[PDB]
Assembly symmetry: C5
Homo-oligomer: 211 residues x 5
Amino acid sequence: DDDKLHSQANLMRLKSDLFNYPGPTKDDPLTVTLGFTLQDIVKADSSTNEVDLVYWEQQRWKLNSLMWDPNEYGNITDFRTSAADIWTPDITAYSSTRPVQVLSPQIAVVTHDGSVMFIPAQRLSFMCDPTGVDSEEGATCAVKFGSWVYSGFEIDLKTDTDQVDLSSYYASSKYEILSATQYKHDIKYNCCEEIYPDVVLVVKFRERRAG
Amino acid sequence: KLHSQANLMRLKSDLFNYPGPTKDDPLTVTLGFTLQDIVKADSSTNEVDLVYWEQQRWKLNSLMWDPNEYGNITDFRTSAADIWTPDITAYSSTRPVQVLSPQIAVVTHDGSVMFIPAQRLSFMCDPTGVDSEEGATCAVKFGSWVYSGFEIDLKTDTDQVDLSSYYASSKYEILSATQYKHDIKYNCCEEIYPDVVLVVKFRER
Amino acid sequence: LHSQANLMRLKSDLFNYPGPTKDDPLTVTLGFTLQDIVKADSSTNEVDLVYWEQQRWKLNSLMWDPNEYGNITDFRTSAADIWTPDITAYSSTRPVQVLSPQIAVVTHDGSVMFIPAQRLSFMCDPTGVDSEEGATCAVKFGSWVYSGFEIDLKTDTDQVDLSSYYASSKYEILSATQYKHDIKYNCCEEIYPDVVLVVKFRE
Amino acid sequence: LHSQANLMRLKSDLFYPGPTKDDPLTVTLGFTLQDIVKADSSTNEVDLVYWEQQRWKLNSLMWDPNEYGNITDFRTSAADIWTPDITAYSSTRPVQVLSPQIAVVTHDGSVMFIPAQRLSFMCDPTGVDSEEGATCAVKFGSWVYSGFEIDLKTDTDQVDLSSYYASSKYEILSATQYKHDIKYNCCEEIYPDVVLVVKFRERR
Amino acid sequence: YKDDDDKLHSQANLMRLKSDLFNRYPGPTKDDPLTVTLGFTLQDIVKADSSTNEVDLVYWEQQRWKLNSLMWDPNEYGNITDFRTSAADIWTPDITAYSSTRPVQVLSPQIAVVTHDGSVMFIPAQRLSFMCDPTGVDSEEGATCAVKFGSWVYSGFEIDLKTDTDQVDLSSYYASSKYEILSATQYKHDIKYNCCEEIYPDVVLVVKFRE
Ligand SMILES: CC(C)Oc1cncc(N2CC[C@]3(CCCN3C)C2)c1
Ligand SMILES: CC(C)Oc1cncc(N2CC[C@]3(CCCN3C)C2)c1
Ligand SMILES: [Mg+2]
Ligand SMILES: [Mg+2]
């Protein structure tokens, strides 16, 4: 219990030492790794061509300014902190139709090597024609995710896998998933020498009664 | 009276003028539910809406005091924004949870905190069967979003959901409501991830 | 200009209370004025009310001598500037919506009056609203966290004020009462007073 | 560059506990009605969009322009100043603010504030589908001040319909904003309001 | 180490630039007026409600202006020529839809790009409900609606509102929207309002569309 007291003291000192980053630049680029876990397709609205998804969006990056030596802080190897306490990337859906609704606490995990893990659960409405959702072939919709203001020369956007994690998809959803991918795409624009990356979520789905 | 007030302002000042738990400073959080109403069961989207009181209790050595040194004050009320609170989250919500009560906690001199938010939650639930004798069954998990069992050790006092305040004229009657202390582990690793699973069997009244 | 300085002074003095305790308990008087039953939803058994909730209490720490401040006997101030009681509907189904400014009137004897207008959705079965006898619903109001030993809840009348009820509402009011009750809840050892709004209404 | 420093200097020098019987204020109010959006006969609520012009004058906001680079006015966040607690007395939802919360202060101490708002209020739309139309009314005034602290004025008793949406679902037959001063038998204080009265019908 | 040092130095230089600009603007005036250039990119007509004559649009609103107080010499800051910053860190113009029927909803991060010549570019994505009769949307001719954008409180003598083109950018319009765009323009106008003595400029978005 005294050991509990010391651990708490060492964490307070670590946080003070770390917290008491202006974002990436061409000279100091940052890798941001993204992955999606799709939990539910809640609603597919054919009157407005909007579909509503619930997913967990895993984001990971590493900063030198968040590094420490566990030995100088009682072997603390990671801690939790408010996502407001730190810089976070401006990763955005490019075709949402409503402000995204955040479903989880905005808290990140920081590890002694300076890596940050942040996994917000989100409900998103996005542009999607659900024609065919009541057929055996199903509907197909897609939404791109990427930085709002940074090129690939500033935020190098990566994934760990092309596959959307479906292991938590709600088994009694109104919609069954036929496939879900998160392929990465690059676009070269006329205006800029820089490349712009996105991760596109592509979901093929149908009414559970359509099969 | 003026004295008891200055003792309390002094206590608060002394206490308030916690970085959360860690593997070496783990915290036990006890959870229990009072189910007040099933408001809405939407078969077009498979979402159900519940209203419940979520009782949370934990203890911090940093919130301990001697009542004798503070005018025999044994507890006080404080804004939940004034203290650390655990990040207990429904794991299958479909809308942000709506808070229905004041965000005020009770702190007792042994360092124990009691916090009981009333909430409305929309969560994933197929109500097929609700219009039958057998009813429908749904489940939702509650737990920390970011802490494993090494940091927040989640407990229950009972597995019996409190139904004594359940709305007697709800559109839905409760056949049973149980709160289970569950966990999952990856065999590769020591970390365990606990949750309280709220399981509710219900039908059209 | 002198009056302005006197008021600025008085407010500085007063603002530059940790809430009630068992050793320093507080009386809060509640009264309701019902303006409108807006909506009765039989699909979810929720009814929507618009009402004003009059709250009154008195603190020694808010007292002053008017002669020491230019004969100022009361002032208006943001309800955020002072402590306010945590009076809550116990069976709301949506967060309560405030429809008026949150401004309290403080009087030199330390008494405070605060009267927010609110729209509330709450648990209510409207069966019978399309009949002569109507529907009856009830909602309790009280402190969320303070027991009877910390906040004593009083009323000035057992009848809800209907003198401002909207005369072209979809619903007419047959009766509306606001009796006091005391209840032990399973979570806790202490007894909690409330004011129960009971309303009978029909289309 | 100099004009910026003077403006920053003005604001610093300037930056009020509200009016009193000894220090009273007059608020001039007027409405510009843009749209009747929805008339809901299942709940007897009607939804309006309007601009609410508010004007008042504080001695504590006066300055000599010659002491500040000939500056005669400035824009500021409505949160940087005291604003009157003018409220609809029969709303059924919180008002939604549709414009930036910015006021203009002028060197005579006058403030102008014109929030665009969507308001749901209590209104039975029976008759809207007829030649005569429906009529509804909502009173505006201070929530906590009497006429001895805040008096109300209007520049006109006719609602400005010059911005009313021509292809609204509802056409306006008339719209007035008469000011009333009520003395209740109980009390010395006078209670002013401005009542928005609108007669309207489904556009044909 | 050199590479890591070089990253440290570019971070320091950016942090220092932001401190010099921010930690050491009150808006335009008749004596110090500001040009604001606007342009719209229309992404989707989501919904047309004939029961209330409200239509819902998703668009990106490009705003550009230039401040002397935001200038710097890149040679004085490690050759930094532009940077990204929260739009809360700088003054932004009070550009408003004049006939919205609900508060505008912001769909993107609110981050501006500031360039060493003092120019600012800010491009929020928004969902807007505005006054619009969709009668005729179910016909070959379609419906036509308009909405004005401009400053709420600054007259033409304070903010001079310009465009780069009379044409709304449709190159990102959602190909499977419920509604097809027939034309979309953004002409400038100058208007006298009853409340006020001054002339106020607007940019009017006029959109012709059909099912
Ligand atoms: C033990 C007590 C001092 O602390 C509390 C903290 N939060 C809520 C409560 N309560 C008590 C009972 C209840 C149920 C309805 C409102 N209320 C008084 C919630 C109590
Ligand atoms: C008189 C001016 C200096 O102060 C103001 C304050 N608020 C709004 C406004 N206006 C001016 C006209 C109007 C109507 C539409 C938006 N706009 C420019 C509202 C003006
Ligand atoms: Mg020790
Ligand atoms: Mg170096």
